[PDB]
Design a protein around this ligand. Structure first.
Ligand code: 210
Ligand code: 210
Ligand code: MG
Ligand code: MG
Ligand code: MG
Ligand code: MG
Ligand code: MG
Ligand code: MG
Lengths: 339, 339
């Protein structure tokens, strides 16, 4: 695996990122806190979004053009994608009332952190533009990268607004949980930043700035993003937290999950009433009742059939839109998403 | 007053900003929520930071160069400074546990908003870069403006970290409340975004990009920022909430206020013990005890003498560093700050 090898080399570069971001004695205490925020929240994941930048860069740039400075800028932009994700996740954990992430308690759940995590999240986002300035300022793709990260943040935030508006706390929202609504939330809240952003960053760094090539890449990557969020929704309830590193909250949070959308399409009038009575509530027995209904409607089997259909669809889109990019750019990512 | 006239003309342009930011039917609901966030949080203030952009622009640019498009870009950048402030304040109200702002309950205290305000704050920040792209993309100062707003956000966030680290909830922190600590917090948390950012934005728009001229402007503006935060700290306890539009929380939040720093410099060993026992706690009787101690040490009189000394100092800095900029750029702002 092209990711599995480059993984340890990627993590080894974190130490330099922290040193450069921690490099005015008056702000000493604030800088020591930023280092703590970085070390707790940006390290511990699979680093698939950040590694995608590095792997795509090595596949798109001519090896004679892959000098020490060029590769350093590639790893740094990969770490900017990981920082963007860390910004979103620190805040998403507060708004989703989550307990754990990447095998440890959520940063905001830590004694002595609490709602100060809001500012900590904003500092993580600020660090992206600090790194882009320090390493890419004199490059011709500088403005393209800045605008890509800003645009990806706007899209994600619009997606999170849709996610939160469809999931009001204390209100029965089954009418809102439609396939059309689900597809819009997922496109904006995760597909852009998770798949389009790292490949587009590598494309701009390789000097591929054409509107058509970015549109063709986006066509594959947004569909891959849709499947990744469906899988994330499935694992929220049916995944092993020792593997996922987090505890699911979608049922309690009244979320427009892929699971609830599939339930509503297959439920009898009686089964709809069970869902209405038990969904979007904090009671453990009500959550268990929803999971029992999902297993009764064979939703894990419906998911298994969907993964197969989605995989074939994404492969047909790679055949249609990959050119002139090497298909291996999209196949490597598809190998990581589909298990 | 050059601000008092241009105030109504500034507010009249908000309608266009909202229309352009609310201009894909799938994200309809999210866009309707963004409009609600903008209308609740960006309108209702004095608009002094946003007006500073417009007034400084008209004073720095030749009237023959002040065309309809140029002025439209000036009002828009003024509204970007107001959006940046709205982003910081929506989040600062959550972390300071505030109740009201600009005469109404804090956005997060609204029933049905709560911690979703975290995402709402992030959308306000995203809107800045949406407006810069839509109006300033083809201008030579585009990258300078983007970098100025990003740098101002980083500085402010570093300042807020320092503010929160010096004010731990549940801990007696009087040792930390020094003049040197206070001056660092204030420089970063408010002075850059409140005074340096709007003048620098107008300077870049007028084609004044020289390192020396920006350094000379900053020398005046950061000192003005220091006084504005001291006045804000004084009004937190001794101001009229019908005038300030907000309720003070500095004593309850264990903040390193200018007032507590002055108290600690003038307190007898007995008075220090009263402060230690009553500061940084939510009990109304303990807050009242701290205010009684402040009035006993004549801190409102100490503030009155400070405003006079600060005013003379800022005027001496205008005489020293204003040139070649018209002194009226700094005098107009000084007239607004000093009451
Ligand atoms: N997309 C952000 C984070 C998530 O994927 P996560 O499962 O919390 O990591 P969400 O389900 O809240 O959308
Ligand atoms: N500077 C941000 C907001 C304040 O000025 P405000 O008094 O809450 O408006 P703070 O005192 O929290 O610093
Ligand atoms: Mg979540
Ligand atoms: Mg979420
Ligand atoms: Mg999830
Ligand atoms: Mg405050
Ligand atoms: Mg504050
Ligand atoms: Mg205050």
């Amino acid at each position: 695996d092209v990711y599995a090898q480059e993984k340890q080399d990627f993590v080894q570069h974190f130490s330099q990122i922290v040193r450069v971001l921690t490099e005015h004695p008056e702000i000493g205490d604030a800088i020591a806190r930023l280092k703590e925020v970085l070390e707790y929240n940006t390290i511990g994941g699979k680093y698939n979004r950040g590694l995608t930048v590095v792997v795509a860069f090595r596949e798109l740039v001519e090896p004679r053009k892959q000098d020490a400075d060029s590769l350093q800028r590639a790893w740094t932009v990969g770490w900017c994608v990981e920082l963007l994700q860390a910004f979103f996740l620190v805040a998403d954990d507060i708004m989703d009332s989550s307990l754990t992430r990447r095998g440890q308690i959520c940063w905001y759940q830590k004694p002595g952190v609490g709602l100060d995590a809001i500012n900590d999240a904003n500092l993580l986002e600020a660090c992206i533009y600090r790194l882009l300035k320090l390493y890419c300022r004199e490059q011709p793709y500088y403005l393209n990268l800045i605008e890509l990260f800003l645009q990806s943040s706007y899209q994600t935030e619009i997606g999170q607004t849709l996610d939160l508006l469809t999931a009001p706390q204390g209100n029965v929202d089954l009418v809102r949980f439609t396939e059309k609504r689900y597809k819009s939330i997922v496109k904006y809240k995760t597909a852009f930043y998770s798949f389009y952003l790292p490949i587009a960053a590598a494309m701009y760094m390789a000097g591929i700035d054409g509107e058509k090539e970015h549109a063709n890449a986006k066509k594959i990557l947004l569909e891959m993003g849709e499947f990744a969020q469906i899988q994330d929704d499935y694992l929220d309830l049916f995944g092993d937290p020792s593997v996922t590193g987090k505890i699911g909250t979608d049922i309690q949070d009244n979320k427009c999950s892929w699971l609830v959308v599939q339930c509503l399409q297959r439920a009898t009038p009686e089964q709809y009433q069970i869902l209405k009575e038990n969904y979007g509530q904090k009671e453990a027995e009500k959550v268990a009742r929803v999971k029992a209904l999902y297993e009764e409607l064979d939703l894990p089997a419906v998911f298994l059939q969907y993964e197969e259909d989605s995989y074939s669809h994404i492969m047909a889109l790679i055949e249609q839109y990959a050119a002139p990019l090497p298909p291996a750019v999209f196949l490597g990512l598809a190998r990581k998403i589909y298990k």
